[PDB]
Amino acid sequence: ETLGEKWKARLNQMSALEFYSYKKSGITEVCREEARRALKDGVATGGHAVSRGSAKIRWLEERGYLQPYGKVVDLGCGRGGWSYYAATIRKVQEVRGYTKGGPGHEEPMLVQSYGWNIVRLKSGVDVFHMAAEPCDTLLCDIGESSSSPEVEETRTLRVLSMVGDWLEKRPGAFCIKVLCPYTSTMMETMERLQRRHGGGLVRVPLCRNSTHEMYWVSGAKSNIIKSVSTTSQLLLGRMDGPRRPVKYEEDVNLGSGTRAVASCAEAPNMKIIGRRIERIRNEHAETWFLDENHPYRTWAYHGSYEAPTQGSASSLVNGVVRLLSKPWDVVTGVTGIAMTDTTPYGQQRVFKEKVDTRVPDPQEGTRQVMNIVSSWLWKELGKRKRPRVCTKEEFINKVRSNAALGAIFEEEKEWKTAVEAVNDPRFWALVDREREHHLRGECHSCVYNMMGKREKKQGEFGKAKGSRAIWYMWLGARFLEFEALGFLNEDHWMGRENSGGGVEGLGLQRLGYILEEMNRAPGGKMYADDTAGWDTRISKFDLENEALITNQMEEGHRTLALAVIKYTYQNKVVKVLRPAEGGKTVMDIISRQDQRGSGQVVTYALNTFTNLVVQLIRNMEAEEVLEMQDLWLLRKPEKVTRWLQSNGWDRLKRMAVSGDDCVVKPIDDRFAHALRFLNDMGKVRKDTQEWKPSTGWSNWEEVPFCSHHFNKLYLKDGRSIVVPCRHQDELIGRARVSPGAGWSIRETACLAKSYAQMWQLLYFHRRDLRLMANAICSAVPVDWVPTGRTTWSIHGKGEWMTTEDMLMVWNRVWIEENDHMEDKTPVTKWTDIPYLGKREDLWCGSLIGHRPRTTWAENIKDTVNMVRRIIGDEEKYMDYLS
Ligand SMILES: Nc1ncnc2c1ncn2[C@@H]1O[C@H](CSCC[C@H](N)C(=O)O)[C@@H](O)[C@H]1O
Ligand SMILES: [Zn+2]
Numbered sequence: 001e002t003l004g005e006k007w008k009a010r011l012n013q014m015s016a017l018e019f020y021s022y023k024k025s026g027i028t029e030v031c032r033e034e035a036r037r038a039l040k041d042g043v044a045t046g047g048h049a050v051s052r053g054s055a056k057i058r059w060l061e062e063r064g065y066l067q068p069y070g071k072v073v074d075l076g077c078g079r080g081g082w083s084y085y086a087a088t089i090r091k092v093q094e095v096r097g098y099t100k101g102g103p104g105h106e107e108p109m110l111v112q113s114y115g116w117n118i119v120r121l122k123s124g125v126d127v128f129h130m131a132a133e134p135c136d137t138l139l140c141d142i143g144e145s146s147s148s149p150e151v152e153e154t155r156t157l158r159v160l161s162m163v164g165d166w167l168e169k170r171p172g173a174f175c176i177k178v179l180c181p182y183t184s185t186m187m188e189t190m191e192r193l194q195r196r197h198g199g200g201l202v203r204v205p206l207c208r209n210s211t212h213e214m215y216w217v218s219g220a221k222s223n224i225i226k227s228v229s230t231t232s233q234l235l236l237g238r239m240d241g242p243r244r245p246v247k248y249e250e251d252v253n254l255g256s257g258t259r260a261v262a263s264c265a266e267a268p269n270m271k272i273i274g275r276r277i278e279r280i281r282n283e284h285a286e287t288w289f290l291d292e293n294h295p296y297r298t299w300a301y302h303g304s305y306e307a308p309t310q311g312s313a314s315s316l317v318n319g320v321v322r323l324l325s326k327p328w329d330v331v332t333g334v335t336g337i338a339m340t341d342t343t344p345y346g347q348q349r350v351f352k353e354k355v356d357t358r359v360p361d362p363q364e365g366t367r368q369v370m371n372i373v374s375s376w377l378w379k380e381l382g383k384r385k386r387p388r389v390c391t392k393e394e395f396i397n398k399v400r401s402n403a404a405l406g407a408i409f410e411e412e413k414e415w416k417t418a419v420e421a422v423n424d425p426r427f428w429a430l431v432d433r434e435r436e437h438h439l440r441g442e443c444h445s446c447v448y449n450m451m452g453k454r455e456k457k458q459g460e461f462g463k464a465k466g467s468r469a470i471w472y473m474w475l476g477a478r479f480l481e482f483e484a485l486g487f488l489n490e491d492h493w494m495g496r497e498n499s500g501g502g503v504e505g506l507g508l509q510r511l512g513y514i515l516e517e518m519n520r521a522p523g524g525k526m527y528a529d530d531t532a533g534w535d536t537r538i539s540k541f542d543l544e545n546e547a548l549i550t551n552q553m554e555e556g557h558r559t560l561a562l563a564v565i566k567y568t569y570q571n572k573v574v575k576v577l578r579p580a581e582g583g584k585t586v587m588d589i590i591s592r593q594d595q596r597g598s599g600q601v602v603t604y605a606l607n608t609f610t611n612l613v614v615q616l617i618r619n620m621e622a623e624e625v626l627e628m629q630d631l632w633l634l635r636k637p638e639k640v641t642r643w644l645q646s647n648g649w650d651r652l653k654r655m656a657v658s659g660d661d662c663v664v665k666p667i668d669d670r671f672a673h674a675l676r677f678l679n680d681m682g683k684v685r686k687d688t689q690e691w692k693p694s695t696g697w698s699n700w701e702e703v704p705f706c707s708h709h710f711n712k713l714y715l716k717d718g719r720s721i722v723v724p725c726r727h728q729d730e731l732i733g734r735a736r737v738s739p740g741a742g743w744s745i746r747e748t749a750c751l752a753k754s755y756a757q758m759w760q761l762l763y764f765h766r767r768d769l770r771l772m773a774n775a776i777c778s779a780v781p782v783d784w785v786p787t788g789r790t791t792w793s794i795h796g797k798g799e800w801m802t803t804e805d806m807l808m809v810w811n812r813v814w815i816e817e818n819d820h821m822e823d824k825t826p827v828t829k830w831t832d833i834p835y836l837g838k839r840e841d842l843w844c845g846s847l848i849g850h851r852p853r854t855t856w857a858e859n860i861k862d863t864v865n866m867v868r869r870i871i872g873d874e875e876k877y878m879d880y881l882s
C-alpha cells in the first residue's frame with residue numbers, strides 16, 4: 001500500500017543471505033573497535049562512547065536537528081550513549097537517564113566521560129508507568145523491532161502515547177525514536193502529532209537498512225509523508241542493484257573528567273578556616289592548583305593536588321557460607337548483595353547526588369520553635385547530669401587498636417597506630433598546642449578526612465553500589481572533641497532513663513521491649529519515618545541549638561566546647577580524593593557550614609537530640625499547638641513552653657530515637673499530616689511525596705526500627721522474649737560477602753563462624769538461619785576464634801565474637817542479664833528456644849516447604865562433611881547438627 005509497507009513486505013520475503021547482504025549495503029558505521037576493547041577492560045577514562053547511540057545523536061546535533069540544553073531526560077537510556085553525549089554539550093546542565101535494565105535488557109554503564117558528574121542513570125524503570133516531568137530537552141530511544149508491521153505500529157503508538165504527556169510540558173528540544181513511521185495509521189498519527197507538538201522526521205544514515213526507524217527531532221520541518229517516503233525510496237533502491245560498500249566514520253571521543261558547575265555554596269568564613277586551607281596548600285605547593293572543572297555546587301572549593309587513589313570496588317565470596325547455602329544461589333535478594341565501591345569515582349558518584357546539597361534555611365517562626373524546644377530539652381537532660389571535661393586518661397582507656405589515626409599534616413604522621421600514638425608524649429604535645437590555638441580563637445589542625453565506607457550493600461547496574469561518605473578528623477583533633485563534648489556519651493545523656501525517648505547503650509535484644517511498652521500507651525498508630533540522609537539535613541540552626549549545652553558548662557569548659565563547635569562543626573574543612581581526566585587522581589580541599597560529619601565524637605549523641613526536638617515539634621504541629629502562620633512568625637511563643645512543661649516528657653517517653661532512626665507513638669493520627677514544620681526544618685521523609693501524609697502501623701511487631709522489626713515469642717515453658725527480626729535474604733547475602741581481598745581459608749572460615757554465632761544469638765528464631773548456623777559451626781573447626789565484623793550497628797553489641805558456648809551466651813543475654821525477664825530459670829537445651837511463627841518466618845524470606853531447601857536440610861550432614869575437607873581434615877570439629 002505505502003512505499004514503506006512495500007519495503008517491509010520485500011524484507012520479509014528476503015532469504016537469509018539476501019537479508020545479510022542488504023542490511024549494511026551503503027550504510028554508515030562508526031569505527032567501534034577501540035571502544036569495545038577499553039569497555040571490556042573497563043577504561044572509564046577513555047573518552048569512549050558507551051554505545052553506537054552516541055554518534056546517532058552527534059549526527060542530528062551537527063545538522064541542527066537537535067540543540068540540547070538545560071534539563072535533559074533520556075527515556076530508555078540503556079548503556080546511556082545519548083546521556084553521556086548530552087553531558088558534553090556547553091548548554092546542558094543536568095542529565096537524568098531512565099531504563100528497564102535487568103534480565104535481557106541493557107543496564108547503564110558507569111564511565112568517566114567528560115561531564116559524568118551531571119549524569120544520573122536509573123535502572124528498573126518502566127517509562128510507561130512513570131509520570132511526566134518538566135524538562136528542557138526530551139530524548140526517547142524506545143522501539144523493539146518486529147517482523148510484523150502490525151506489531152511495530154502498536155509498539156510505536158504506545159511510545160507516542162507516552163511522550164505526549166511529556167511534550168505538553170513544552171520542552172525546548174526533543175528527539176523521539178519513531179520505529180514504524182511508514183504505515184497509513186502511523187502517517188495519520190505523526191501529522192496530528194506534528195500539528196500539536198512540532199518538529200519533524202529525520203532518517204539517520206548510521207542506521208542499518210533493516211529498520212525504517214526515524215527520529216522525531218525538534219529542529220526538523222518537512223511533510224511527514226514526504227520525509228517517510230523519501231526514506232522508503234532509499235531503502236527500496238538499496239535492495240535492487242549491486243551491494244554498495246559501507247561508509248566508515250571515526251567514533252565520537254566524549255573526553256574525561258568532571259564538568260564545571262553552578263555554585264550556590266555559602267561564602268567561607270576565611271578568618272576561621274583560612275589557616276588550615278593555607279597549611280594544606282603549603283604542604284602540597286608543588287602540585288596544588290585550582291581546578292576549573294571541579295564538580296562542587298554547595299561546597300566551597302579551595303584547591304586540589306595530585307594524590308594517589310585509595311579504596312576498591314572488589315567483593316569476594318565466603319565460600320564456606322556459599323557452599324552451606326546452595327538454595328540461595330538462585331535468590332537475587334541474597335546473590336545481589338556485595339561490597340561497596342570506595343574508589344575515588346566510587347564515592348564521588350554518591351557524593352554529587354546525596355552530599356552536595358544545600359537545604360534552604362527554615363523560616364524565622366520555625367527557627368524560634370526549634371530554639372524554644374532545644375533549650376527546654378537541654379535543660380531537661382541536664383536536670384540530673386552535669387557537663388564535665390573528659391580526660392586524656394579517659395580517652396586512652398576508650399581508644400581501640402582498630403581506631404583510625406587520620407593524620408593530615410607532617411607532624412601528625414609519626415605513628416603507625418592509634419594505640420602507639422596515645423602512648424607517645426610528642427602526640428599529647430600536639431593536642432596541647434591545638435587547645436592553646438582554640439583558646440586564642442584559632443584552629444590550625446582540625447581538618448576532616450573524607451572517603452567511602454566499605455559496606456555490604458545490594459548492587460546497582462549489575463555493579464557494586466557507590467559508597468557513602470565517612471568523615472572523621474585526626475586522632476588529636478578528635479580528643480579535643482572528646483574532652484569538650486565526650487561527657488554526652490560517657491555519662492549516657494541520651495540513655496532512656498535520662499532522655500525518656502532515647503535508647504543509647506541498649507542492644508538489639510532490648511530494643512523490641514521498648515516498642516512493646518510504647519504500644520501499651522494509648523493514642524494513634526506508630527510512625528517510623530526515615531529522614532532521607534539525616535546528616536546532610538542538619539542545618540546552621542540545628543548546630544546552633546545543639547551548642548545550647550554550652551550554657552550548662554563552667555566558663556572554661558564552655559570556651560573549649562565553643563571553639564570545637566565554631567571551628568570544627570559550624571565551619572568544616574574537608575579533604576576528598578576525586579578522579580581527574582587522563583586517569584589521574586586529585587585530592588580536593590572543600591568546606592561548608594551546615595551538615596553533620598559521620599566521624600564526629602558526638603554525632604550519635606547530637607543526631608539523637610536534634611531528632612527528639614524534631615519529633616516534639618511534629619507533635620505540637622499535629623495537636624494544633626502550632627499554626628499555619630507560625631512558620632513565618634511565632635505568634636504567642638508562650639504556648640510552646642506551656643505545651644513542653646505540660647506534655648514534654650509524656651510525649652518523649654512515647655518515642656524511641658537512636659540517632660536518625662525514630663518511632664513516635666502519638667496521641668492520635670494527626671501526626672501523619674503534621675508535615676509543615678517537618679519540611680521547613682529540611683527533615684524531608686524518605687520515599688514519599690513531600691506532602692503525602694505519613695503511613696503508620698497498627699501492629700507494633702511490623703514497625704521498622706534500626707533496620708529491624710521485633711516479634712514477641714513465647715518459650716516452651718511459657719515465658720516470653722521480644723526478639724529482633726529482618727528479611728533472611730539481607731542476612732544470608734551479607735554473610736556470603738567477604739571484605740578483605742587475598743584471604744586464607746581460615747580468615748573466611750572464622751568470619752563464617754562470626755555470622756553463624758550472631759545468628760544463634762539474635763536470629764535463632766529463623767528456622768533456616770538456626771540450621772545454617774549449626775551447619776557453619778559444625779563445618780568450621782571448634783577451637784577457631786570468630787573474627788571480622790558482622791554489623792556496623794551501635795545496637796549489635798558483639799556478644800557472639802567468642803570461643804564460649806553459644807547456649808551459655810544466649811542464656812546470659814536473654815535470661816540472666818535480661819531486665820525484662822523475671823524468672824531466671826536457665827534454658828537447658830536449644831530445642832526449648834522457639835522459632836518465629838511459620839507465617840512470619842515465611843514472610844521474612846524463609847524457604848521452609850520449598851523443595852530446594854527441603855533437600856538442602858536432608859543432606860546438610862554430608863555437605864558439612866564436604867566443607868570439613870575444604871577447610872581441611874586433620875582439623876578438629878564438633879557436631880552441632882544433632
Ligand atoms: N518500558 C521501558 N522503559 C524503559 N526503558 C525501556 C523500556 N522498554 C525498553 N527500554 C529500554 O530502552 C533501551 C532502548 S536502546 C537506547 C540506546 C541508547 N540511546 C544508547 O545510546 O545506548 C533498551 O536498553 C531497552 O531495555
Ligand atoms: Zn582546631
Ligand SMILES: [Zn+2]
Pocket residue numbers: 709725726727840841843844
Ligand atoms: Zn520478621
